[PDB]
Design a protein around this ligand. Structure first.
Ligand SMILES: [K+]
Ligand SMILES: [K+]
Ligand SMILES: [K+]
Ligand SMILES: [K+]
Ligand SMILES: [K+]
Ligand SMILES: [K+]
Lengths: 257, 251
């Protein structure tokens, strides 16, 4: 009814369209000044690296070095450690499978085979939607489990003569802030040391992860090697519950709108 | 229902295992193969030049690793900006669509902090327009078929089956304009293989966005339309492929 109806009005879209278009333009102008100074430090920057090895070592020709770069190119282009770290063992392959259905897709360990790409194609067409079924399912019992809990302490708020305005003015904020505590503030200060990131990196990782954006610029566990069996299912378990609570909030306020 | 959930949970969990098993078989050879062959080139170049120590080589192989990771082209030796307004505009399209290629990673803390607030706002905001377009796109499209549909209902074809016929044609002309045509273009303009043009589109459409393949990211192809017009298709491609998923949930 309202979902197509509010969009059925052509003026609502085209105004929102130009809004989004210029919302993208504004973000591009900001993103430019924030990052343009420091990105392409590789294309021409390696050019000085070659000479600083042609100068540093007269014993090596440029063509010998040119082949060396081309040799290590196909080496790095398939899996090479600049120094066990197998990125396709069942542990990490399970992680890679999860990034597909969650639509996170870090791509930090991309597919090489034309057989693996085809397998992933059908794996995504079927795997992704049925994952959302379970995620929306968990959110049903998860949201109810909080409200069971939300209700118990709610009794105390109303008794202390804070008006029926309490809801809807309070029980929404405390409901989200406890989730903001458990699935954002708690993991960040954990990940701030568990991966030894800075303050913003832990927060930046969580958001891009939970928003299913998944740049792949930040997993850093393995930062060098996965190391511990703690993180492996638990973080995916955190992502799962992170998405579930994320789903609960977007759905509940969907009703309130 | 807790009965369907916990049962589906084991179904989903094993679906990941079954996927991880086959993924291992199709990738563990190729990745670990190069890991062994890298040690060869380390030896092979330590042989050719005893003048160069391994530590001085260890720095270099990491420098070229830092370079190649940055997308440094090993082809010739020595402008096409990445954070130019045209591609930075496309970069914003990666977050709000939750595609997030990550091919051009961020670096500045100010850029990441601004991206934090920009992502939280833009993503549900985009979904409103996307679904909004998908409603109007589906409506304007459904408006067009009716002309042809009126002719089809004369050949004594049962209206019960006329229902099913259009349902096929709905997705067929839909994928034709948003799967076949994009892949045939990507297989041509990017000269990717058939399994790379399809692979790019699908991973992009489902917003998985591995970033390994990105159309228009190729610095050379300077056809004036290609850079943002693909993203224009991405919008319509997202809206259509998502609107079907809603009707999929119904049927
Ligand atoms: K996504
Ligand atoms: K990515
Ligand atoms: K990379
Ligand atoms: K989505
Ligand atoms: K993604
Ligand atoms: K991604």
């Amino acid at each position: 009814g309202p979902a197509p109806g509010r969009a059925m009005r052509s003026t609502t879209l085209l105004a929102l369209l130009a809004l989004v278009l210029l919302y993208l333009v504004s973000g591009a102008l900001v993103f430019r000044a924030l990052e343009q100074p420091h990105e392409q430090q590789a294309q021409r920057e390696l050019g000085e690296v070659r000479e600083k090895f042609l100068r540093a070592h007269p014993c090596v020709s440029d063509q010998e070095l040119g082949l060396l770069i081309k040799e290590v190119a196909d080496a790095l282009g398939g899996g090479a450690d600049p120094e066990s770290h197998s990125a396709w063992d069942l542990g990490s392959a399970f992680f890679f499978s999860g990034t597909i259905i969650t639509t996170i897709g870090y791509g930090n360990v991309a597919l090489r085979t034309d057989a693996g790409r085809l397998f992933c194609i059908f794996y995504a067409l079927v795997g992704i939607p049925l994952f959302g079924i379970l995620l929306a399912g968990v959110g049903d019992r998860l949201g109810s489990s909080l409200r069971h809990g939300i209700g118990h302490i709610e009794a105390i708020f109303l008794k202390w003569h804070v008006p029926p305005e309490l809801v809807r003015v309070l029980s929404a904020m405390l409901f989200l802030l406890i989730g903001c505590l458990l699935f954002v503030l708690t993991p960040t200060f954990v990940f701030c040391y568990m991966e030894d990131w800075s303050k913003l990196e832990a927060i930046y990782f969580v958001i891009v992860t939970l928003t299913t954006v998944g740049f792949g610029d930040y997993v850093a566990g393995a930062d060098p090697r996965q190391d511990s069996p703690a993180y492996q299912p638990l973080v995916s378990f955190w992502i799962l519950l992170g998405l579930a609570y994320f789903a609960s909030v977007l759905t509940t306020i969907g009703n309130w709108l």
